[PDB]
Design brief:
The structure is a homodimer.
Chain A lengths: L10 H11 L3 E2 L8 E2 L1 H19 L4 E2 L5 E3 H4 L3 H7 L4 E6 L2 E9 L4 H11 L8 E10 L14 E11 L2 H22 L5 E4 L11 E9 L4 E12 L1 H6 L2 E3 L5 E3 L1 E8 L1 H10 L16 E5 L4 H16 L4 E3 L5 H11 L3 E5 L1 H5 L2 E6 L5 E5 L5 H25 L1 E3 L3 H9 L3 E6 L3 H13 L5 H5 L7 E6 L25 E8 L1
Parallel strand pairs in A: 3-7, 11-23, 15-16, 15-17, 20-21
Antiparallel strand pairs in A: 1-2, 4-6, 5-6, 7-8, 8-14, 9-10, 9-22, 10-11, 11-14, 12-13, 17-18, 18-19, 21-23, 22-23
The structure holds adenosine monophosphate (2 copies), proline (2 copies) and magnesium ion (2 copies).
One adenosine monophosphate binds next to strand 8, strand 11 and strand 14 of chain A.
């Protein structure tokens, strides 16, 4: 019917109601797996089409590798298998007959693809090799599952590239990272912070991991929104991906891998949804505009149909709801997230105008028919997009606090902020901060029931350090390493 | 690199060489699973884009349901689970720990989707409900795996529709079947025969199954190319998919399901490939035209202009100006990979203001005056290639369908590589009789035997269009025990994959 708990009253219950009552998602009888209904899958198809077109400009090609991976392949890279083992699902029988060797469901495809890379790459003329696939992924998550954010089966693209040099590899890492920033900001109207993961948080077998971090204002938590890894020669040495180089010597290839998943949808909903339900960014909205005739009515009906037809020919995803009272119809499409409603009533036609209502702010205003067109409606949709992004970015920036000392850090953390702290890289320092922040923290009942914690973890070391204050005289948060002077700022906070 | 085994010499070895040396597919260390390389996956993406656009016109919407299904759901429809049980893969462990509840990988999604259909459908106003998904599926095939044709993981679309009446459901079955025909003929240049499966061959839980049958001329085998099922109320009764109708009664929904897979690619290759390698139908060719300068400043600029004009016209074109490679080497390189049209730009031809074209399917070479060169005229050549590929295969298929009124005629036509039209009266026992008896009297190649195939004939389909078939008068049932069941249609029987 409608949403009966406010977003700030019970966040996880609000989330469940919004994603199901909007017809985005349904629950399923396999734990941690969910059903993507049409309006929801439309968002992921929209991301696919945009991202596919951008990586084609880079020479990346789509492929499909198998779902299954052998134990022998999985166990090839030391760091990788150790970091993924407990989350690997194993097929052990077919029908009633046991397999000779159990085989695993892919948690990620490095060990599935790279034996082929070693065969296909023989010369520098075979490089760069840049492949991508849109697939499903299985990770038997131990943490509490969260729709979209953390599902046991999820959908992604994973790109895997091999290069003759580190310089080419580095360039791709940040090129893809910019593309992930563009998916979030230009399609989903979600602002991001680009950064590098600390040593403790980076991908197993990577030399370094970059990330686009996102912020959930309601409970003050970050979400790792997508990652782009430089694997160096770590995987090519273990899988023997070698090539006859320019210096006539045999060299190991430099590799990257990068992935973006349906976690995007959860961030979009958690950022933009409100107490009336979904609020869809126009460029991924299954329906961008709904036209509602307010109901002698013959003329009004024909003008209503012409408005619909003009928008449809312009390529706007438009619906005509000529079914029920206006108020009931209004709630119907508001719950489902439609960005713009056009109301055509008799009083409006007398003044040669229509009434518009934008979902993100609820503002209502009139537009003269002389100003109505496919292009002017598109401009309204772009204005909504910009407002949604600008609002979220302003809130995010206000909720990032420079905390030079521990008391500032704990205060900002417990009031739902992310923190920029003086940082000197150390696994021991990161663990110290995680433990001490947890001990001095408090979180909502909803977060506690969701299996979340009040601990602060490292989110990223932001790429752009230019707006941050001076590090002079600042002390390490970890007293045992007081002599290791902070040499950058790191973003820490609570997370999913 | 080249194909060193001929298509007619050793079909399975030819097939392996063509799919790997063209960079379409690679083998993998899990039996029955294969790697789809870029040029190959491009064909399936091309099918996806065409088919998705067509079903959208019908109101079908894309979704995504989970990979996993519970034992409880799977066992809900009796016939369905009995027909798939031996092929279902089971997840039983995570990490080092046995799961308390094993879960299965989807062999097909009826039992995954229909509990939700029962929730989403409440009134006739909720109907029709038409959903589709592009997914991977797992069937732990007992038969020997065949790249594309029969893999243990394959990729498909599966559509699932529910209607208020049988009439609406029947109409959709044949609308989708026509779409499968169009995929094969208009994209893949493969001719099809539409028909209904016999009772013994139809989908488990279906009221009837329709099919597009295709023909592999080299070993005289049919391939079931895609299927469109009417499920009647069999699944809606078991999953309680009910609705309040207009007359205020409670009724079970009528349902269909229909699926087309990457088997399409295998049929495309087996039909069109030759002794030089892949032969790609132009509308799924990763590269439709390759432009090759014979090496010069003027010639280079004209070569680039040809490339630019074709690219602006939306043709998928490549310029092969690689330096340390001979022209003949370049020719073989792209012929092996299946490019349908090659343009050679040499100094002698440009002096006469013309270019040399070579079409992959027949190998014919001919010149085109630059005054006639354009995006449209090159597209016309590509469409001519497409029609030729389709017409050649259809002519070959039709010549290999023989009307066999008696058992001796049937065996003779079967052993000389034909499909056979036989007098037919539906009966599971008659079909089993024909299969067993033909197996005893048939012989197949070593290549087919090694591929896990059989020389036995099975029912392929009862063709929908019987209008060209001769009279059944005086013909006897092929099954002597059922002589009292008089033939009342013609059925297509033959060897198959
Ligand atoms: N359980 C999950 N559900 C959804 N997306 C996930 C999950 N785990 C990781 N991801 C996404 O997968 C990609 C790689 O994550 P990671 O290997 O943790 O860097 C990123 O785009 C993540 O957002
Ligand atoms: N093992 C397989 N590999 C590839 N395609 C298959 C396989 N089994 C069935 N198909 C395809 O899946 C769809 C359904 O097949 P069936 O359930 O036999 O009607 C059809 O389009 C078949 O061609
Ligand atoms: O799982 C990951 O994080 C990396 C990036 C995509 C493929 N593997
Ligand atoms: O497996 C089959 O044959 C049917 C058609 C697609 C969905 N299930
Ligand atoms: Mg993880
Ligand atoms: Mg089968």
């Amino acid at each position: 019917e409608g949403i009966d708990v406010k977003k700030q009253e019970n966040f996880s219950e609000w989330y469940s109601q919004v994603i199901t009552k909007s017809e985005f998602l349904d629950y399923y009888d396999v734990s941690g797996c969910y059903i993507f209904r049409p309006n929801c899958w439309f968002v992921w198809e929209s991301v696919q089409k945009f991202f596919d077109a951008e990586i084609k400009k880079l020479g990346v090609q789509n492929v499909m590798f198998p779902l299954f991976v052998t134990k022998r392949a999985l166990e090839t890279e030391k760091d990788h298998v150790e970091g993924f083992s407990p989350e690997v699902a194993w097929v052990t029988k077919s029908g009633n007959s046991d397999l000779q060797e159990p085989i695993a469901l892919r948690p990620t495809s490095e060990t599935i693809m790279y034996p082929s890379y070693a065969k296909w790459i023989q010369s520098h003329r075979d490089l760069p090799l840049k492949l991508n696939q849109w697939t499903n992924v299985v990770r038997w998550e131990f943490k509490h599952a969260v729709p979209f954010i953390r599902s046991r089966e999820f959908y992604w693209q994973e790109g895997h590239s091999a290069f003759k040099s580190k310089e080419e590899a580095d360039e791709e890492v940040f090129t893809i990272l910019e593309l992930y920033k563009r998916v979030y900001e230009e399609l989903l109207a979600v602002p991001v912070i680009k950064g590098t993961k600390t040593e403790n948080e980076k991908f197993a077998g990577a030399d370094y991991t970059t990330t686009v971090e996102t912020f959930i204002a309601t409970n003050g938590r970050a979400v790792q929104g997508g990652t782009s890894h430089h694997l160096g020669q770590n995987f090519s040495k273990m899988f023997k991906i070698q090539f006859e180089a320019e210096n006539k010597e045999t060299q190991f290839a430099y590799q990257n891998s990068w992935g973006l998943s349906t976690r995007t949808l959860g961030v979009m909903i958690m950022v933009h949804g409100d107490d009336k339900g979904m609020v869809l960014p126009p460029r991924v909205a299954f329906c961008q505009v709904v036209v509602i005739p307010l109901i002698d009515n013959a003329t009004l009906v024909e003008k209503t149909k012409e408005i619909y037809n003009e928008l449809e020919k312009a390529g706007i995803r438009v619906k005509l709801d000529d079914r029920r009272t206006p108020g009931w119809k209004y709630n119907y499409w508001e719950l489902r997230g439609v960005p713009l409603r056009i109301e055509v009533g008799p009083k409006d036609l007398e003044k040669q105008q229509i009434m518009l209502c934008r979902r993100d702010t609820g503002e209502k205003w009139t537009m003269p028919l002389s100003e109505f067109s496919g292009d002017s409606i598109k401009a309204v949709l772009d204005k909504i997009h910009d407002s949604m992004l600008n609002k979220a970015r302003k809130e995010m920036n206000e909720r990032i606090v420079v905390t030079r000392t521990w008391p500032e850090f704990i205060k900002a953390l417990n009031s739902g902020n992310m923190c920029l702290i003086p940082w000197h890289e150390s696994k021991a320092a990161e663990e110290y901060i995680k433990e001490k922040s947890k001990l001095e923290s408090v979180q909502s009942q909803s977060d506690a029931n969701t299996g979340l914690t009040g601990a602060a973890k490292s989110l990223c070391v932001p790429l752009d350090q230019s707006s941050f204050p001076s590090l002079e005289g600042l002390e390490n948060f970890y007293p045992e390493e007081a002599h290791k002077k902070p040499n950058c700022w790191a973003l820490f906070g609570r997370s999913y």
